[model samples]
Target: GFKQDIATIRGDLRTYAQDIFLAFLNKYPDERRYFKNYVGKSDQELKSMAKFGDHTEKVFNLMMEVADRATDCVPLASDANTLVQMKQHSSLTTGNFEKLFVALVEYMRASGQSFDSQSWDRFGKNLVSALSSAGMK
Candidate 1:
């Protein structure tokens, strides 16, 4: 299963969370304004901040929560609920979610995580679609 294929990397979720968050910021520098606690903080400093670590964990956990349920037949109601609630508070567009998926994929490769591209592509597309539809409904 694709889950087993990347299980080793999943073990290091904290590291992945940090790197993926940094990677997203690297590409979308302007997005940093949204992370007030991270503003003006170097990567190392950000890593040491409780606020940074906690927020990153929340981001990664929610993402993996949605992805973890992908193979299930049930509707993604809970995941959609969390996303909508976050969207209301954070005001992040679905476009931002798409870009974050891109960052997640790129970091998976850059960080030497073993994963099948086709599988990741399918997962990313499904996630983005779910997120988009969640916004509409």
Candidate 2:
């Protein structure tokens, strides 16, 4: 199921991230301060299509690695550290990171994509826990 799920959505990964960001930004525009430079751009191009796709690829690739592992309860500190460094701003908090996790899950269902609800939900929970405990800064 895990592999199949990944396979199913693998190609849509970038779009998934783009859609989530658009939806979240649309719903909560105040969060845009973190990405303030793209103020005049359309929501779809909030961070530029290329950067959005790249970020999506990076985040989901790590997620795939995490989910691909058996008995993996959380993301590694190294992974979180790497993600933190890749971040555009140091203003990101654990709660901000947690929202990104939630946004992914929310968008998957919102877009009517196929997903193993239980598996993905659990994965998101673990991810949030990891980011929160690993103390993403």
Candidate 3:
């Protein structure tokens, strides 16, 4: 018997990415605001540079593009242990995954949208779960 396996990939991919940024912000709102107000330039100026899109798809695509570009500098590995270790290591100096996560969040915020803490928590927990599921720890 020949079976054709059609797998459907379904999940909150966009939310996943957004939450990562959100978690970062929630942990370091002061730093985030600092960047937003100072290091990042004025909020209004940033808003003026935004290229608006018509759909969530466009926004998601743009987000992915930014992530891809940023990650290219130091890409995370497919191995769960590596990711877990990397996140844990980054947390040491930056105040845990949540705080380190803020860099991405600040980037997103500078681009103009607000992210919530709940989403950040969800993403962090999920990443931990994935690592565990893969027998990383």
Candidate 4:
């Protein structure tokens, strides 16, 4: 069911990062400092920023790759490095990253993106282990 669950959410990830981000920022406005470049931008304007779009795409791609290998146990070296760089640059803690994941899950479900609960649980646990391996608590 790994591939099937991924299929359910892949297209939504491509299109809905902006909406997910809006929901997250609405809930955790303090985290906005991590995205200083996008500060003061409206949803439409944020979508227009090349920086925002690029970062969002990178994030979703990483999510897809991680989910694709959720059963592997060991983390992807590149993916862990990516998180390390993000944490180093923006001080986005692992806990904050989890918040974004929660926001993504909630937004996707609310928007009717289909996924089996079991697959998401696998992915979430995998991510926590991955983050820990990357020196992110």
Candidate 5:
């Protein structure tokens, strides 16, 4: 049965953005130039990108929001290390970017509340299902 009231939101949209960007660049090679040429900027300059109302602006805003939230819910050093390991394992075994994503979701969920492996598994499955429906591998 689905655990509908997990009570914790365990997903980092920034990591999703990174995965999506990697996958997307694989398909659209030209985009690599933009990232490669990205220059360091002040927070004000970075935020200005979002105000332009262009496609880049929208994505920039989303990423900025993710960064902002990440600063608030800092995870323990061990948990962070475990999550990185899990992501590497998933990437090697599944060859699916979404699998690496589950690590971030699990980390977020576990950090927000007490540890619960069963709930984490359920959330991971749900995320995989949703991603599958969206035609992501």
Candidate 6:
């Protein structure tokens, strides 16, 4: 059920999330060289083969965790409590946040969604804020 339920449990978002990060690798190669290993060195290698997708699970979980509690806020929601602690520690910046949001819209369009993208943008802004609130950059 998780595989097919795109509207609820949210597994497909991982696939979309992969695309989001992939776009960063493509669009900002120089800027994203921080994790040069994950830029996917070989065309024959899949994202998972390069271990890039695995590295992103935690980040994607952060978005879903916040989206699940955009309003019901606790000190933070679920995994986000752990994420916010990195605010004082992580290298990610506001620029990185903005890029991820741009890639998210790209994903939506590539997924063939139509109309009312306004809602997706609103949700994306919330996710970006949550990342910062949780100490992103």
Cα lDDT of all candidates, in order?
0.71, 0.63, 0.39, 0.67, 0.38, 0.56
Which model, 2 or 3, shows the larger TM-score?
A: 2
TM-score, one value per model: 0.83, 0.70, 0.27, 0.76, 0.27, 0.65
Query: What is the C-alpha lDDT profile of model 6 across 22-128, one tens digit per residue?
Result: 77567666655676664546533545463666666656666666655555222244444465556433676656656765666566556555523444466666656
lDDT of 4 by residue, 3-84 (tens): 7766655676646555667788887888788777888988789888887877876676767776676454345766766776
For model 6, name the residue pairs that clash: 84-134, 87-135
lDDT of 1 by residue, 1-137 (tens): 46664565468778878888899899888888777778899999998888788888777776666766767323276676677677533577766766776876777667654665456666767666676677633
lDDT, ranked from best to worst: 1, 4, 2, 6, 3, 5
Model 2, global lDDT: 0.63
lDDT of 3 by residue, 1-110 (tens): 00010010014544443444344545566545433433454434433443311232343454333234322122223433444555423333213433554454454455
Which candidate achieves the best TM-score against the true structure? 1
Q: Which residues of candidate 4, in runs, are more than 4 Å off?
A: 72-78, 85-90
User: Which model is ahead, 4 or 5, in terms of lDDT?
Assistant: 4
Give the per-residue lDDT of model 2 (tens digit) for 1-137.
55677776566777655666666666666777776565668765655557656865776666666666625345566665655665463667766755665665676666665666556767666766665566564
- Where does candidate 6 stray beyond 4 Å? 1-9, 43-50, 72-84, 87-89, 114-116, 127-137
Q: What is the lDDT of candidate 3?
A: 0.39
Tell me which of candidates 3 and 4 scores higher on lDDT.
4
Per residue, candidate 5 scores C-alpha lDDT tens digits across 49-133 of 5432244334534323332333223223333233335432233222243443454345535454454545444444543444344
Q: Deviation in angstroms for 33 in model 6?
A: 1.3
List ranges where model 1 is wrong by over 4 Å. Answer: 72-77, 87-90
Q: Any runs in candidate 3 off by more than 4 Å, and if so which?
A: 1-27, 33-40, 50-96, 99-120, 128-137
Model 2 regions more than 4 Å off: 44-52, 69-73, 85-89
Cα error, candidate 1, residue 102 (Å): 0.7
Between candidates 1 and 4, which one is better according to lDDT? 1
Task: Give me the runs in candidate 5 sitting further than 4 Å from their true place.
Answer: 1-97, 105-112, 115-117
Counting only residues 3 or more apart in sequence or on different chains, how many pairs clash (N, Cα, C under 3 Å) in candidate 5? 0
At residue 87, candidate 2 shows an lDDT of: 46
